[PDB]
Design a protein around this ligand. Structure first.
Ligand SMILES: COCCOC(=O)c1c(C)nc(C)c(C(=O)OC(C)C)c1-c1cccc([N+](=O)[O-])c1
Lengths: 220, 7
């Protein structure tokens, strides 16, 4: 559809500008390997994921028209899912990062479900457009805590879901299951809200300096 | 405040 193609190109122009700075990528190879240096790298990565996702969010069609408090509630409420999704994308476009994660002092209670999500979404071989649309769909969720005008958010989310589904008919014709499989990775993704809340209470994790952006977006 | 600034 003519209005849908315009929507999609707008999403892609914004999504394609997102990149993790090469300098962080180099750190994966170049830094000393210790629990503390490893944790720091993951912190800088997480911080940059939020940075990028804010820039992406403020370019989503309609987002600037929303009530200001609702904007904030979206950013904070969708942060955990969006960041986790983005970290899966980064990881799957690496062996070394995995080893750093496995040796950063983070408990296997949290590491295990993380790698299961990464593997699951990796096996789906999602295209750049699927990542972009899903990301936008996660950010524009009308069910976040404290949203005053949920119907306004729903009107921004629904055309993205339509484009995404419709795309799935276009590129994977006669297989309704590709789209349903995308939505099942979203089911895994949402389980991370609870994993995250528990990690923040944990000893190792909370006895660190998180960056200011992480502190703020996670309501620490 | 941080979030509003970046937005
Ligand atoms: C690329 O970064 C990995 C993705 O990172 C997150 O998006 C993320 C989220 C939502 N919540 C927390 C509290 C952290 C965290 O405490 O910071 C790092 C410094 C240890 C990170 C997190 C990091 C690793 C594992 C897990 N985990 O549940 O397995 C969570």
């Amino acid at each position: 559809t003519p209005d849908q193609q315009t929507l999609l190109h707008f999403i892609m122009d914004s999504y394609n500008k997102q990149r993790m700075p090469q300098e962080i990528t180099n750190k994966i190879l170049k830094e000393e390997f210790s629990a503390e240096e490893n944790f720091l790298i993951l912190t800088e990565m997480a911080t940059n994921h939020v940075q990028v996702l804010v820039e992406f969010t403020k370019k989503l069609p309609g987002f600037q028209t929303l009530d200001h408090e609702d904007q904030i509630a979206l950013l904070k409420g969708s942060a955990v899912e969006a960041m986790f999704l983005r970290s899966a994308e980064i990881f799957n476009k690496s062996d070394l990062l995995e080893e750093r994660i496995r040796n950063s002092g983070i408990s296997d209670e949290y590491i295990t479900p993380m790698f299961s999500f990464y593997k699951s979404i990796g096996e789906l071989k999602m295209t750049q457009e699927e990542y972009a649309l899903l990301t936008a769909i996660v950010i524009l969720s009308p069910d976040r805590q404290y949203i005053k005008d949920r119907e306004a958010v729903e009107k921004l989310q629904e055309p993205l879901l339509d484009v995404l589904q419709k795309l799935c008919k276009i590129h994977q014709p006669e297989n309704p299951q590709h789209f349903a499989c995308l939505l099942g990775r979203l089911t895994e993704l949402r389980t991370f809200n609870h994993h995250h809340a528990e990690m923040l209470m944990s000893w190792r994790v909370n006895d660190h300096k998180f960056t200011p952006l992480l502190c703020e977006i996670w309501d620490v | 405040a941080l979030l509003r600034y970046l937005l």
